[PDB]
Amino acid sequence: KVFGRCELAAAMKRHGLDNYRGYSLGNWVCAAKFESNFNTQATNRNTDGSTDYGILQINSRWWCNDGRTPGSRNLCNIPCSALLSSDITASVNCAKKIVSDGNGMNAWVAWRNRCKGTDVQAWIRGCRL
Ligand SMILES: [Cl-]
Ligand SMILES: [Cl-]
Ligand SMILES: [Cl-]
Ligand SMILES: [Cl-]
Ligand SMILES: [Cl-]
Ligand SMILES: [Cl-]
Ligand SMILES: [Cl-]
Ligand code: NA
């Protein structure tokens, strides 16, 4: 599914991401835009042989099992295919584990390079939330 900006903001708010570990909703929408272009089916392969999955590009090296990332962990305890669902619940629940992990949203390279220190409130402007 390719989300609209406000549709995704509303779904993330319903799933408890607004101010989760102090990150306002616009941070999460900004990260999703630049990681996946709001497409739940996005996949991208890394040089190390791991793959990033779904709207928040969660990596198979640590967070999910894809059956082809040798010596990887599965810290969210989910098959990586669950992260490609039109239902963002699995992505959101895993993202909460990631952002609790000690480097906050700096875990997301697109967030650090494209969202951090910008007016992220712009990403939820105009939305009925
Ligand atoms: Cl947009
Ligand atoms: Cl915000
Ligand atoms: Cl594996
Ligand atoms: Cl594991
Ligand atoms: Cl699993
Ligand atoms: Cl959803
Ligand atoms: Cl933090
Ligand atoms: Na894994």
Side-chain angles (χ1 to χ4, degrees):
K1 169 174 185 176
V2 180
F3 277 81
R5 172 177 71 84
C6 292
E7 183 184 15
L8 181 61
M12 286 180 154
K13 181 151 182 230
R14 186 171 78 89
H15 284 283
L17 281 185
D18 188 19
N19 305 129
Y20 193 81
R21 288 285 184 283
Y23 295 90
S24 66
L25 192 54
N27 283 287
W28 297 101
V29 172
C30 187
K33 168 73 182 165
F34 292 121
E35 289 287 359
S36 69
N37 207 18
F38 301 145
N39 182 6
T40 68
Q41 297 193 71
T43 64
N44 282 294
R45 193 87 188 263
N46 309 303
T47 61
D48 70 357
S50 62
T51 302
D52 298 333
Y53 293 87
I55 197 123
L56 286 171
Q57 291 288 280
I58 290 169
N59 189 76
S60 64
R61 172 69 52 210
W62 305 102
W63 305 103
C64 63
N65 178 237
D66 64 6
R68 61 163 206 201
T69 313
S72 73
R73 308 290 313 267
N74 183 7
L75 283 177
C76 294
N77 259 289
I78 47 159
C80 298
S81 64
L83 297 173
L84 304 181
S85 180
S86 62
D87 180 344
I88 68 170
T89 300
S91 286
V92 164
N93 286 350
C94 187
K96 288 177 172 172
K97 176 155 279 140
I98 297 167
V99 73
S100 300
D101 194 53
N103 75 163
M105 285 198 76
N106 292 297
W108 288 277
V109 177
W111 179 85
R112 188 166 39 76
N113 290 329
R114 300 187 75 180
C115 302
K116 184 178 195 181
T118 73
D119 175 27
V120 296
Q121 191 273 324
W123 286 99
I124 62 171
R125 188 163 298 145
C127 305
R128 190 174 316 111
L129 302 169

